[PDB]
Design a protein around this ligand. Structure first.
Ligand code: SF4
Ligand code: SF4
Ligand code: FES
Ligand code: FES
Ligand SMILES: [Fe+2]
Ligand SMILES: [Fe+2]
Lengths: 633, 633
């Protein structure tokens, strides 16, 4: 089972699933092998009814698509559609939150409100919306309106790009025609250009992809901004992770998906319903997180994280998961069927994301509390039904310190330098105590033993004094393996990094360090890393492609992760991907994405499946940046 | 060669291509066989980096996708993405025209103007935009603004749906949540919902597809409306079709793609440049059409059509095609390479549609005449280079009467009943002289011997007194085989239909009938058939799903054609498709699209690859409609 997951709790549940005959994602993977090599390499097209077309990577015919599409074109079109799909997900989540905010401040949904007034005003100032003499509800309405306006063409480009990067970066991107005109506009233009008999020049196609990846960035940044207004900007919080956060004697309710608009209300209403759960024989309602909706409520409220991506089914296998409350994205639809075996009540809530066999609740903001109580009552009923049934919850959990928004990082640093908070971080980059910064982002992927790349690469980087930050299932991996527990700083961190984490931690009164890795939140909250890195670039008076900052989507899976990797490259970062995207069928496309794009944006992909090698390549990238700033390395 | 194309001119060029060693679409097809059966049946997914996933149609594992996606889900997601892609193309073309109109009336591009004032005012009235006391430029600005607003969410749904169908149809669609909220909004929502770990219920997915197909309809209707304002509403016109419209002694320039925004200017400027072409030794500039940009200029100006879809390369093989001027969609990218052998100058013009090896001209409305002259001068240079080179233009062409906009059909009918123009058509439906109406739409497809389905089915329908209308490459097929020549009415038409075509024709002073098939224009101009059918439904006080009207995408290829077929079903029509879309891997999805959707929209797909059988099924569908109206059949 160690060949499937490096998480011991997952291994334990994989043994239980096997003896019970419950098929898992890893079983379904095994049943799929050998996988199609045309698709793996990107040399397949189904963009018209003359296909499917394929191209042999090597050898004889077929060499070209039926319409004449080359390997270059086919690979680039496929990639562009994945970027557009990722942009559609992040920006759909953001759009939904914009509508929520509008409802809140129009008095249409009293369960929602402006929680973070400081965030609201800062965003309005970033955007150039006046605040002086305006009511908060009106400033919010303006913010929501501006968010919605970034989805279509208008007299300005997408402000959730141009107002979040430094002018010198915007100027480089503008020069190459890369600034998006509108989020849904770009998504549609990708779908058009990639359709049969349209764009058929790899460079042109890939420039379009880069632009659409910035539309994805805008969606991410918008989603973080709006969720912080509605639900609060995260600050440091202490919690736990892994399956051992489940409790046999409680009603265990997982919140799973990405948009926390209802799950944030579930957290608050569950508390209210404690005496009702006790009436049903439970100690209370124990809300736990899966995936990014889990990350959202972890970051804001300290809700413990149960599990992430690839291992999500394992929470059900314990027998103790009374309900799984779903929004959208990254939910294996197997959960609906596994529920028949495990007894879990799986509940969908969003109109555009249903799963055959799951019970659907028509969530509406105006009815959010009513919805939450209905859902929680189903969970309580489910808990009652498992009266007397043994459960098998692995007694495995880690301590997690999280909540490191960019605001929180800047505040923590300000305890070392109140009026120039970034300076202590830069001072330590310069003196070598911090070698650089690495963002771990993205998924787990069944192809890679769960967490192995994230932990292998992080361990090497941390020993080499890299400041590591993480989001999404990268954060999930690292938290489940102890990288968010400050007790592990001595073991994991190089001396320079330890000194910095300790100095910041002791200035924040902790009597001890920051954790080894800073959890910056959900997948949209990759935008928080952009804010930090843009702030550093502006403080130094350089562009992002001069900073010793890299990214690693070490176990990438979703189209969303491909979009994030692509905008990381576009904003100027060396960006590792630890699974093969479907590009290797075209050497020219590979050479653009790994090499010639450096000349355009300064960033580039590093495609490397061996994690020890990837760590060495990431360090080399960091060190090349240091050398370009004239620093020792 | 008759196994490849039923067009004799195409056969002749296929012989020339073979002896010259120039690879064609049919050669590339042969090199692709056998094609992948997973893709053909829809049982392949590449929506995340855990794939590719496939499912065996029959037998053992794999049975399910890695994430748990069933065959139902995989098939429905794939189909939905094709619909969204088609919507992106039609609506991208419409969007571009909206911007053109705005430029025109703002004084930013004097080559463009309001040509059809009557169309402008009728559209403004349909939309509820005031005209009384307003300047034309301001009414136009309002129309353009309304067009652009239909791409995003706002306080109304998409007006290019709700204002073009009858209220009773809109009410049925609204009840099922099918009215689009915004064109690019829906495209993005499809891409989101179909991404990994989102929507996973076939019915839910397919309802989303139906809604997105209405966004495609809106794009089609918008595109027709705006092109008619800018360029003129078509009226009856006489021209010719097939390769024999090329002239050895002239500069032959093809206009190819779908958006005629520049090619309409090329038509007018080419005339201006006659004395300059004569200076270069040519008789003049002979502009000819390929595909839908060809249809646009045929319908408005009587520009002869050279060829269509699958056979497009054959125009180059003649050796006489001096230039091919490309916009976007349905252009085989092979043309750029074939040009190296044939000498043709292939020129791209749209930013998002380039082809490696083709010369690019950065078209801008403000510079349209300058662009046109540059392009025409390249063509003249090319003509000079082939001085003394024999060419092989098949001496094969047909006569074509076309230009049957809905306005033109209503006008023609009005000569029989001035104040109730639809009544003579309805009277003849009722008395059986017209059995019903069939729209032929969509592509050719290399899988089907070119034109064979269109001509086989049309011939059977016409003998059974069906009024046949056609667009796109369906029109192209029928025109190249003589179905737009009124001289062929005696041979092709049943006695009842002949009597009607004759009575209308003689009332329009023609001394003879309308042609056997009415050419209603380009692919966006499928919207014209919707206008006609909606007008009939309103005149009868019934919904579209009670009318004896059917559609046939007999040789479908492009994602655009899948979107059109889907909205034809959604608005209530029995809709034949003569190529397999990738659905047969899921019986449940097939049963929804061919059967249970009848209960939702009244329409349904008829999937039938044998054209004689398809004709019988289409007649049965027509006759069932007649029986439901209490009519003899
Ligand atoms: S777009 Fe070209 S390469 Fe793709 S399926 Fe159609 S014919 Fe084949
Ligand atoms: S979305 Fe599911 S079925 Fe599709 S490739 Fe990914 S794991 Fe396979
Ligand atoms: S041939 Fe396998 S992914 Fe298409
Ligand atoms: S396995 Fe052939 S289309 Fe994917
Ligand atoms: Fe996530
Ligand atoms: Fe067309």
């Amino acid at each position: 089972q160690n060949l499937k997951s490096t998480d011991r709790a997952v291994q334990q549940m994989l043994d239980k699933a096997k003896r019970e005959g419950i098929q898992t994602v890893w079983d379904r993977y095994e049943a799929m092998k050998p996988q199609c090599g045309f698709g793996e390499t990107g040399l397949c097209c189904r963009h018209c009814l003359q296909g499917p077309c394929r191209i042999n990577p090597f050898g004889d015919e077929p060499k070209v698509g039926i319409c004449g599409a080359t390997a270059e074109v086919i690979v680039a079109r496929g990639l562009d559609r994945s970027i557009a799909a990722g942009a559609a997900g992040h920006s759909g989540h953001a759009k939904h939150l914009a509508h929520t905010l509008k409802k809140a401040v129009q008095g249409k949904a009293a369960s929602y409100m402006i929680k973070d007034r400081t965030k609201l005003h800062s965003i309005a100032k970033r955007l150039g919306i006046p605040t002086e003499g305006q009511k908060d509800e009106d400033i919010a309405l303006e913010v929501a309106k501006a968010a919605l306006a970034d989805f279509h063409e208008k007299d300005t480009p997408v402000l959730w790009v141009t107002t979040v990067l430094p002018p010198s970066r915007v100027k480089v991107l503008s020069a190459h025609g890369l600034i998006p005109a509108g989020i849904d506009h770009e998504i549609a233009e990708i779908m058009h250009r990639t359709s049969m008999g349209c764009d058929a020049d790899a460079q042109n196609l890939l420039l379009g992809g880069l632009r659409c990846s910035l539309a994805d960035l805008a969606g991410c940044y918008m989603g973080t901004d709006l969720a912080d207004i509605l639900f609060g900007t995260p600050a440091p919080v202490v919690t736990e992770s892994n399956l051992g956060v489940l409790k046999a004697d409680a009603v265990n309710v997982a919140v799973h998906g990405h948009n926390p608009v209802l799950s944030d209300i579930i957290v608050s209403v569950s508390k209210e319903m404690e005496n009702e759960a006790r009436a049903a024989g439970a100690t209370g309602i124990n809300v736990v997180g899966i995936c990014c909706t889990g990350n959202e409520v972890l970051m804001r409220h300290g809700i413990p994280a149960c599990t992430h991506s690839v291992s999500q089914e394992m929470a059900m296998i314990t027998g103790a998961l009374d309900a799984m409350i779903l929004d959208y994205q990254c939910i294996q639809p197997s959960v609906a069927t596994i529920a028949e075996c495990t007894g879990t009540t799986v509940i969908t809530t969003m109109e555009m994301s249903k799963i055959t066999g799951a019970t659907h609740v028509n969530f509406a903001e105006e009815a959010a509390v009513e919805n939450a109580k209905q859902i929680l009552r189903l969970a309580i009923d489910t808990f009652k039904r498992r009266k007397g049934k043994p459960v098998e919850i692995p007694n495995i959990k880690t301590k997690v310190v999280a909540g490191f928004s960019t605001e929180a990082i800047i505040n923590a640093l300000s305890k070392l330098n109140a009026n120039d908070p970034l300076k202590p971080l830069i001072d330590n980059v310069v003196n070598g105590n911090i070698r650089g910064v690495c963002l771990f982002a993205g998924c787990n992927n069944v192809k890679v033993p769960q967490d192995q790349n994230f932990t292998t690469i992080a361990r090497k980087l941390l020993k080499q004094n890299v400041l590591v930050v993480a989001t999404g299932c990268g954060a999930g991996a690292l938290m489940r393996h102890g990288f968010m527990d400050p007790a592990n700083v001595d073991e994991l961190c190089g001396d320079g990094l330890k000194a910095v984490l300790t100095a910041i931690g002791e200035a924040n009164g902790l009597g001890g360090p920051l954790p080894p890795v800073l959890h910056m939140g959900s997948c949209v909250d990759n935008s928080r890393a952009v804010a930090l890195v843009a702030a550093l670039a502006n403080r130094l008076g350089v562009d992002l492609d001069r900073l010793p900052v890299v990214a690693s989507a070490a176990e990438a899976m979703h189209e969303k992760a491909v979009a994030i990797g692509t905008w990381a490259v576009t904003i100027g970062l060396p960006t590792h991907i630890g699974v093969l995207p479907p590009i290797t069928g075209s050497l020219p496309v590979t050479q653009i994405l790994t090499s010639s794009v450096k000349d355009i944006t300064g960033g580039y992909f590093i495609v490397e499946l061996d994690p020890e090698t990837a760590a060495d390549k990431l360090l080399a990238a960091i060190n090349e940046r240091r050398a370009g700033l004239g620093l020792p390395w």
